[PDB]
Amino acid sequence: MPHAFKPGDLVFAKMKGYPHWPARIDDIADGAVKPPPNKYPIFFFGTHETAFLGPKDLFPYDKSKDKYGKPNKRKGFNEGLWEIQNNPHASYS
Ligand SMILES: Cc1cc([C@@H]2CCCN2S(C)(=O)=O)no1
Numbered sequence: 001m002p003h004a005f006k007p008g009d010l011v012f013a014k015m016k017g018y019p020h021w022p023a024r025i026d027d028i029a030d031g032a033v034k035p036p037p038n039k040y041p042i043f044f045f046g047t048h049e050t051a052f053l054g055p056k057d058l059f060p061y062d063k064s065k066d067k068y069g070k071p072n073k074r075k076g077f078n079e080g081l082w083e084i085q086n087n088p089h090a091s092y093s
Contacts, residue, residue, distance in 0.1 A: 002060075005040055010061035010088050012068040013042045013053055020059060020068040021077065022084035026050065046080025048092050 005025050013023040026041040028034055035041050039052040061084060071078050
C-alpha cells in the first residue's frame with residue numbers, strides 16, 4: 001500500500017499549461033527556504049527548476065510512465081526523460 005510522498009520519490013508533476021513533467025520530490029538543505037504547508041519541493045528534470053506542489057499534481061513515475069514518458073517539444077523535456085530514467089538521484093546543481 002502507498003505511503004505519503006517522501007524525498008527521492010520519482011513522479012510526473014503537473015503544472016497549469018505544461019505537460020505532466022518528469023520530476024522528483026527534493027530534500028530541503030539545511031538553511032534553505034522551506035515550502036508552504038502541505039506543499040512539497042518538486043525538482044523538475046531537464047529544466048532543473050523547483051516549484052512547490054501538493055499531491056493532487058503528483059503522479060508516481062512507475063505507474064504513470066507508460067502514459068506520460070514520451071517525447072515532448074517543450075524545452076528541457078526530453079533531457080528530463082533521460083535524467084529520470086538514467087540518473088534520477090544525481091546532483092543537478
Ligand atoms: C546544507 C548546508 C547549509 C550550510 C550553511 C553554511 C554554514 C552553516 N550552514 S547553516 C546557515 O547552518 O545552514 N552548510 O550546509
